[PDB]
Amino acid sequence: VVWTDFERATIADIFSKLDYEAVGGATLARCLIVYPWTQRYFGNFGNLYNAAAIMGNPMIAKHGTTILHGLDRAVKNMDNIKATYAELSVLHSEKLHVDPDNFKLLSDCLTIVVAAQLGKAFSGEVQAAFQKFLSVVVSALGKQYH
Amino acid sequence: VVWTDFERATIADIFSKLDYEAVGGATLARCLIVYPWTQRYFGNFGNLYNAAAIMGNPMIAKHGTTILHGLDRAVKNMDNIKATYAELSVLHSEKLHVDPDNFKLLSDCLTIVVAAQLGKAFSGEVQAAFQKFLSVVVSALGKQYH
Amino acid sequence: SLSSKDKDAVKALWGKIADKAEEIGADALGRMLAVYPQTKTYFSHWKDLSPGSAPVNKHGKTIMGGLVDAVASIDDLNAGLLALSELHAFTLRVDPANFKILSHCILVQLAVKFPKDFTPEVHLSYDKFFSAVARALAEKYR
Amino acid sequence: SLSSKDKDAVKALWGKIADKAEEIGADALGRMLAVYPQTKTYFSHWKDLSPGSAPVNKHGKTIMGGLVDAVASIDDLNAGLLALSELHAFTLRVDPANFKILSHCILVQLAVKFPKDFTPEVHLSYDKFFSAVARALAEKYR
Numbered sequence: 001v002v003w004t005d006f007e008r009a010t011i012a013d014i015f016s017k018l019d020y021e022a023v024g025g026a027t028l029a030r031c032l033i034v035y036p037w038t039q040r041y042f043g044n045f046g047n048l049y050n051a052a053a054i055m056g057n058p059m060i061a062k063h064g065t066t067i068l069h070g071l072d073r074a075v076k077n078m079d080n081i082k083a084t085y086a087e088l089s090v091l092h093s094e095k096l097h098v099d100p101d102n103f104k105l106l107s108d109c110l111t112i113v114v115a116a117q118l119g120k121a122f123s124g125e126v127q128a129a130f131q132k133f134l135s136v137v138v139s140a141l142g143k144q145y146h
Numbered sequence: 147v148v149w150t151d152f153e154r155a156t157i158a159d160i161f162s163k164l165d166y167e168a169v170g171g172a173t174l175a176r177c178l179i180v181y182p183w184t185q186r187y188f189g190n191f192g193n194l195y196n197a198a199a200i201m202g203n204p205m206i207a208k209h210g211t212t213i214l215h216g217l218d219r220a221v222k223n224m225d226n227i228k229a230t231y232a233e234l235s236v237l238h239s240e241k242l243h244v245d246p247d248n249f250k251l252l253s254d255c256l257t258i259v260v261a262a263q264l265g266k267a268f269s270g271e272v273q274a275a276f277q278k279f280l281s282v283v284v285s286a287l288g289k290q291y292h
Numbered sequence: 293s294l295s296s297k298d299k300d301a302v303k304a305l306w307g308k309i310a311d312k313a314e315e316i317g318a319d320a321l322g323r324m325l326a327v328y329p330q331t332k333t334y335f336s337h338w339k340d341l342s343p344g345s346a347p348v349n350k351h352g353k354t355i356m357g358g359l360v361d362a363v364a365s366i367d368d369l370n371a372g373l374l375a376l377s378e379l380h381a382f383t384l385r386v387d388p389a390n391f392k393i394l395s396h397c398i399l400v401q402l403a404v405k406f407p408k409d410f411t412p413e414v415h416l417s418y419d420k421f422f423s424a425v426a427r428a429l430a431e432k433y434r
Numbered sequence: 435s436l437s438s439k440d441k442d443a444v445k446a447l448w449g450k451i452a453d454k455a456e457e458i459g460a461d462a463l464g465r466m467l468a469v470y471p472q473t474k475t476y477f478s479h480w481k482d483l484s485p486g487s488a489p490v491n492k493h494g495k496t497i498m499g500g501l502v503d504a505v506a507s508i509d510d511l512n513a514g515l516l517a518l519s520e521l522h523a524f525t526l527r528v529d530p531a532n533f534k535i536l537s538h539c540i541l542v543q544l545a546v547k548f549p550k551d552f553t554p555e556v557h558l559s560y561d562k563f564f565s566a567v568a569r570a571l572a573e574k575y576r
């Protein structure tokens with residue numbers, strides 16, 4: 001990936017605006033509610049199939065925070081995302097056998113959570129930079145063939 | 147990727163058994179008939195609104211043969227597939243804008259044409275090695291983010 | 293299948309957005325074109341692809357009327373969108389991989405203006421609607 | 435939707451494969467597990483995943499029975515497969531992204547045994563059939 005100046009500024013600009021606990025918690029809850037089969041991957045996380053149950057779940061809140069800090073590592077290493085995610089990619093395939101469609105579903109949920117928070121500021125140009133970032137992230141998280 | 151001896155010998159052995167022209171023409175025709183929306187990428191290959199027309203279309207046969215020889219290129223460079231496919235990935239992404247789901251549709255059609263030709267010799271274990279090869283190929287043909 | 297719950301939720305949204313609907317259509321299409329540039333090839337006629345360009349404005353009204361149609365026809369989307377399904381298969385030949393992209397761009401555009409309507413259970417109802425719309429537009433491909 | 439032509443082709447295939455159906459299911463399952471190892475997690479209670487093991491043989495029979503029901507219910511798969519859908523969603527919670535995998539492994543398996551049936555138009559009908567079965571199994575997920 002070759003990043004433009006606008007893109008680098010936008011991406012760090014977005015993350016500097018997000019409360020990782022709030023936003024991460026909301027993103028993960030959103031995914032497990034909108035695409036409820038993703039719940040299978042967290043079967044050891046408790047009360048999980050009523051919707052107020054997912055929103056109230058402290059384990060889900062914690063794991064959503066973990067996701068946002070994982071994304072932060074790519075924000076601070078934007079020219080070296082693949083290497084940064086080498087262990088996470090192994091984890092999500094070899095160990096957890098997550099189907100890669102799910103990375104897109106979660107990415108879309110995060111985008112929607114972000115768009116609601118930022119409002120008018122999340123223009124198409126801004127969204128374009130965010131989605132390029134998520135596409136690099138998802139490509140690095142998926143099983144590596146090369 | 148890392149290839150086992152068995153994986154390496156299976157790939158070379160499958161391709162050693164294929165008529166590239168027969169298999170390639172059958173494969174591309176199968177894709178255009180089973181998944182008809184893939185025709186829109188090929189708007190320069192004559193008439194395509196009909197199975198008989200697709201089946202006897204000489205350009206479709208010629209381009210099917212090209213694809214098999216493109217795959218044969220990966221067979222001869224098993225440990226350098228990404229670089230080998232660097233320019234093809236640019237072509238299929240930046241110039242042609244081929245949705246990546248289409249690579250899986252075509253791969254699936256090749257697998258089924260190959261299965262029908264090879265018979266009981268195309269066992270689960272042979273198919274496993276064949277699918278690993280097509281996943282490596284498809285990964286290197288898609289947009290490169292890294 | 294959409295429940296009566298999903299259907300109410302979708303119709304109420306479409307009601308709330310009425311004022312701003314032409315704008316929402318124009319902006320979401322703008323988003324699709326800029327965010328997912330693979331989609332530009334279907335529109336290589338338009339002089340300008342910016343939000344504010346008259347062809348983007350006009351076609352945005354056109355998409356949104358197709359969706360208010362889908363809303364009117366929500367009980368049998370396959371029947372109600374047959375003609376638009378035919379058009380997208382044979383006159384255009386849109387890759388149905390693209391249907392999902394427009395849907396997301398519309399959800400994103402709506403989220404920027406109406407954030408309070410986007411609780412997770414409501415988002416779930418809207419996503420089932422747009423998935424059903426896409427399946428309906430995909431009916432006539434084969 | 436399946437056409438009357440697609441349904442005829444599917445019924446004619448199902449007739450031809452009768453003597454070999456239980457072996458088709460066991461082999462297809464053997465293919466899924468080895469070729470797409472992400473599916474093994476759903477079956478981590480079988481010590482022997484080779485297609486001649488007793489649990490794989492016996493579950494291959496069950497799958498082919500569920501598909502014989504789909505053939506019986508071909509005019510409305512959604513209503514016909516409802517219990518199987520709720521099972522794979524709520525008892526088993528299977529990532530519905532795995533349905534297309536199993537369909538592919540059944541097609542591959544069928545191809546190796548019955549290659550003369552795999553004309554392009556026949557293949558199109560069979561794929562439309564397995565797509566509709568998967569969409570039916572996906573019904574109750576949300």
Ligand code: HEM
Pocket residue numbers: 038041042063066067069070071088091092096098102103106107137138141
């Ligand atoms: C942008 C996408 C994602 C990112 C950045 C991400 C990041 C992470 C991180 C940092 C961890 C902790 C690993 C560690 O302990 O070092 C993790 C764990 C995990 N992830 Fe993801 N993940 C993503 C998507 C997904 C998806 C879509 C799923 C399921 C469908 C998933 C399932 C899991 C599971 C089951 C764990 C183990 C949970 C735990 O005990 O912490 N992840 N992920």
Ligand code: HEM
Pocket residue numbers: 184187188190212213215216217234237238242244248249252253283284287
């Ligand atoms: C394993 C997958 C594929 C391989 C190995 C492959 C290989 C090739 C090769 C070797 C060429 C010739 C490139 C050149 O002239 O320099 C080519 C061209 C092309 N490919 Fe692919 N290809 C694959 C999949 C696809 C798919 C899925 C599509 C669309 C559905 C597609 C659409 C095209 C088109 C439109 C051209 C240019 C046709 C022309 O103008 O002659 N390809 N491909």
Ligand code: HEM
Pocket residue numbers: 331334335351354355357358359376379384386390391392394395425429
């Ligand atoms: C929710 C999904 C969609 C809806 C409801 C929709 C609706 C419509 C409608 C109402 C028209 C006008 C037809 C007429 O004038 O009679 C149209 C045309 C068209 N659609 Fe879509 N559409 C959708 C998705 C897409 C997508 C995803 C693409 C491609 C990326 C696309 C490409 C086109 C094109 C190229 C036209 C012709 C526009 C022109 O000729 O200026 N559509 N659509």
Ligand code: HEM
Pocket residue numbers: 473476477496497499500501518522526528532533534535536537567571
């Ligand atoms: C062609 C589509 C499928 C059909 C028709 C089908 C049919 C069935 C049927 C009829 C059963 C009941 C077993 C019994 O009575 O003992 C079953 C169980 C099961 N299926 Fe499926 N299934 C399909 C796809 C899948 C997929 C793709 C997976 C996972 C990757 C899966 C995982 C399971 C599991 C874990 C069980 C319970 C196994 C057990 O009881 O030991 N199924 N299926």
